[PDB]
């Protein structure tokens, strides 16, 4: 009874591409953040505005609409940080060694290593970006990956499974379209999906640090961010 499963591969790709949220900007102040207050201030600000675009993007992901409101809330609560991060590493691809949080906000590990901030997570994101770049990740593949994260991350907590299969078909469709052999297709599929385990890892680590930021209570957090963080505690 879900329309998602009736879509074709190209239809799914188009739906997802049309769903893509815009790339948002940070403040136009040109000072490069080296403190935690300043940097974390910019990240919370950015994440807040992105969460609104993400919420409306999610509703345009095929199959998501068919879920109960409660299931939608759960999936978003589970996957919001993963979705932001994979977006980050995506737009950071063409800037090796740097993290493009926004077009006007390009950070390096010297700002990251700069308290706390966290350099470990910073480095993880960079490695992920570099890997996406070396794989020559395509935009169409990226959108499929991001939607998988949305539907899968909170799944454990048939529709979702059947929808996830459709997205799998769509990824293979894209790879076949790119001229990849059968072996290259399933190898690239595995490579991409295994990246999701690390994205999960970074999200969990990031959530622990966001939680710390909350407790330190310096750097106020929006109600939405605290509720998204609460869901994890």
């Amino acid at each position: 009874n879900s329309l998602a499963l009736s879509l074709t591969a190209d239809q799914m790709v188009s739906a997802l591409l049309d769903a893509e949220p815009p790339i948002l900007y940070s403040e136009y102040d040109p000072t490069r953040p080296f403190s935690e207050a300043s940097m974390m201030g910019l990240l919370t600000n950015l994440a807040d505005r992105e969460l609104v675009h993400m919420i409306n993007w999610a509703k345009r992901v095929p199959g998501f609409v068919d879920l109960t409101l409660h299931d939608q809330v759960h999936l978003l609560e589970c996957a919001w940080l993963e979705i932001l991060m994979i977006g980050l590493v995506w737009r950071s691809m063409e800037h090796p060694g740097k993290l493009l949080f926004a077009p006007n906000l390009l950070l390096d590990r010297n700002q990251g290593k700069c308290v706390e901030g966290m350099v470990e997570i910073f480095d993880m994101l960079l490695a992920t970006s570099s890997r996406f770049r070396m794989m020559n990740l395509q935009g169409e593949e990226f959108v499929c990956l991001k939607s998988i994260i949305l539907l899968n991350s909170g799944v454990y907590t048939d529709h979702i499974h059947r929808v996830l299969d459709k997205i799998t078909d769509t990824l293979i469709h894209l790879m076949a379209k790119a001229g990849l052999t059968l072996q290259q297709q399933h190898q690239r599929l595995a490579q991409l999906l295994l990246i999701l385990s690390h994205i999960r890892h970074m999200s969990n680590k990031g959530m622990e640090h966001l939680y710390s930021m909350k407790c330190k209570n310096v750097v106020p957090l929006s109600d939405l961010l605290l509720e998204m963080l609460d869901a994890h505690r």
């Binding site: 509703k59 978003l76 939405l224």
Partner: peptide, 10 residues
């Protein structure tokens, strides 16, 4: 009641 609940309705 959470904000997500509201925003997901819009």
């Amino acid at each position: 009641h959470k904000i997500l609940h509201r925003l997901l309705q819009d």
